[PDB]
Paper text:
One of the most active CYPs is P450‐BM3,3b a self‐sufficient enzyme composed of a catalytic heme domain and reductase domain that contains flavins in the form of FMN and FAD for electron transfer. Reported here are P450‐BM3 mutants that catalyze the oxidative hydroxylation of six different steroids with pronounced C7 regioselectivities and β stereoselectivities, as well as high activities. Steroids bearing a hydroxy group at C7 have attracted particular attention, especially diastereomerically pure C7β alcohols and the respective esters, because they show significant promise as neuroprotective and anti‐inflammatory agents.
Numbering used by the authors: 3 to 226, 230 to 455
Write the structure that this text describes.
């Protein structure tokens, strides 16, 4: 009945427990101690963190709970406005943009993106083919080169040309710094203190970087396509008959450029990490890649046939879902789990990595990397596996991400053997989205021509 809560610090309430650069990992440790639900209060906000499938299945009932803008997401509205992921479900532009953009993620759209995804994937493989003997690969850095370029090209017919730069693209640097600031601002007792004026200035500078790139993309399109940008500019919502206005279009462009790259780069990076730490799994995945990818360019159908590679990616998303949060609020008063009364408006936060370690669902070996868990996906209980969120606010990009990641990981496993040459110790960096910081490998080419 009474809800668990970690210790408080006077008027700071629970906030000092989140003074860390790894908040999801810190909150997982609180869930370890307190169980499937605990309340957390800051001077500015209150939420309840959920970790069990039993309770999360209830939170995913859209007749009782709607998507909530949790604190860091509210901060991102300064950049993303009422773009798709940062709008309330009841905000006019959510359903409008959802209706206008959903056909850009049809299976037919995916088939149309395939050749562009191959273009960027081939650039990754060629970069690695061209390294010298004394070199290694910076894995998340190169995955982010690939995933930013892929959403640029597929979504906007724009080439970031990230493989032509040996430093991250400036859009990446500004994305990391802005999302890091949204993460950190949550932990500040007094965010309007002038101590944080320099953080505000930098956040505005990163916002201007993003908006300058949006201007270039828009100018490029004028000076040149059936893609996301086409639908932003020309589509009409079939419900309201209305188009997106120019202000919301700008928010959507930034929205898709950010969301289209970071979680997918983290996934590819974690997937490669788990493969080199589990060589027998790597061998099985590499065997599938060689058996299926018989042509120099993978076809759309061949990527759909990479079943074990798909299982590898799902299992990586099980252990470290790379956007590890989604938040709900109670639409009306209701009792959660038969035990915890909630009031209309009360916030819930789904701790996805902890959901994915629910032993009553997965068994006791929750920490083992075992892609065979996903051999028969219909055998996984409803709402036990939620790396893409829930309901009408689930990830619109889920099929895009998985097709890109399956294609790229398949080509990687076809073209190289991998060495964990530093015996890398997993260090998970959090800037809202997760990545294995510092993960490096050496690739030995299998000498298979493109
Ligand atoms: C493995 C990669 C990905 C993961 C783990 C992921 C995860 C998520 C999650 C958890 C949400 C729900 C957030 C919430 O409820 O507050 C979401 C929403 C979203 N994702 Fe992704 N995502 C991935 C890839 C992508 C890609 C490639 C795109 C774009 C092409 C994308 C665009 C979006 C957008 C626009 C939303 C908001 C949807 C809406 O509210 O209408 N994501 N994603
Ligand atoms: C806001 C957004 C959907 C929610 C994303 C956000 C990028 C950062 C992010 C990381 C997470 O760990 C949870 C999901 C969030 C909070 C995405 C940027 C554009 C998309 O609309």
């Amino acid at each position: 009945k009474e809800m668990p809560q970690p210790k408080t610090f006077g008027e700071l309430k629970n906030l000092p427990l989140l003074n860390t650069d790894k908040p999801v990992q810190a909150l997982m440790k609180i869930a370890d101690e307190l169980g499937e639900i605990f309340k957390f209060e800051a001077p500015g906000w209150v939420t309840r963190y959920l970790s069990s499938q039993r309770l999360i299945k209830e939170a995913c009932d859209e007749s009782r709970f709607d998507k909530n803008l949790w604190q860091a997401l509210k901060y991102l509205r300064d950049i993303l406005g009422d773009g798709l992921g940062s709008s309330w479900t009841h905000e006019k532009n959510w359903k409008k943009a959802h209706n206008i953009l959903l056909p850009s993620f049809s299976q037919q759209a995916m088939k149309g993106y395939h050749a562009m995804m191959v273009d960027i994937a081939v650039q990754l493989v060629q970069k690695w083919e061209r390294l010298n003997a004394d070199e290694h690969i910076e894995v998340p850095e190169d995955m982010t080169r690939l995933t930013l370029d892929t959403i640029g090209l597929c979504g906007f017919n724009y080439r970031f040309n990230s493989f032509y730069r040996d430093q991250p693209h400036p859009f990446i640097t500004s994305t990391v710094r802005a999302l890091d600031e949204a993460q950190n601002k949550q932990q500040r007792a007094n965010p309007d203190d002038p101590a944080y004026d320099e953080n505000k200035r930098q956040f505005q500078e990163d916002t201007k970087v993003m908006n300058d790139l949006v201007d270039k993309i828009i100018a490029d399109r004028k000076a040149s396509s059936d893609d996301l940008l086409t639908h932003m500019l020309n589509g009409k919502d079939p419900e309201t008959g209305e188009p997106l206005d120019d202000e919301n279009i700008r928010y959507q462009i930034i929205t898709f450029l950010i969301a289209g790259h970071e979680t997918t780069s983290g996934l590819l990076s974690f997937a490669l990490y788990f493969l080199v730490k589990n060589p027998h799994v790597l061998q099985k995945a590499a065997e599938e890649a060689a058996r299926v990818l018989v042509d120099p360019v993978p076809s759309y159908k061949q990527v759909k046939q990479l079943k074990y590679v798909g299982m590898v990616l799902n299992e990586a998303l099980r252990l470290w879902p790379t956007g590890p949060w989604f938040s709900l609020y109670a639409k009306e008063d209701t009792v959660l789990g038969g035990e915890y009364p909630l009031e209309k408006g009360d916030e819930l936060m789904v701790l996805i990595p902890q959901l994915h370690r629910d032993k009553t669902i997965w068994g006791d070996d929750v920490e083992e990397f075992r892609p065979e868990r996903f051999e028969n996906p219909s055998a996984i209980p409803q709402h036990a596996f939620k790396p893409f969120g829930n309901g009408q606010r689930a990830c619109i990009g889920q099929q895009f991400a998985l097709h890109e990641a399956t294609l790229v990981l398949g080509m990687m496993l076809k073209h190289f053997d991998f060495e964990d040459h530093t015996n890398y110790e997993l260090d998970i960096k959090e800037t809202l989205t997760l990545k294995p910081e510092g993960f490096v490998v050496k690739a030995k080419s299998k000498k298979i021509p493109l």
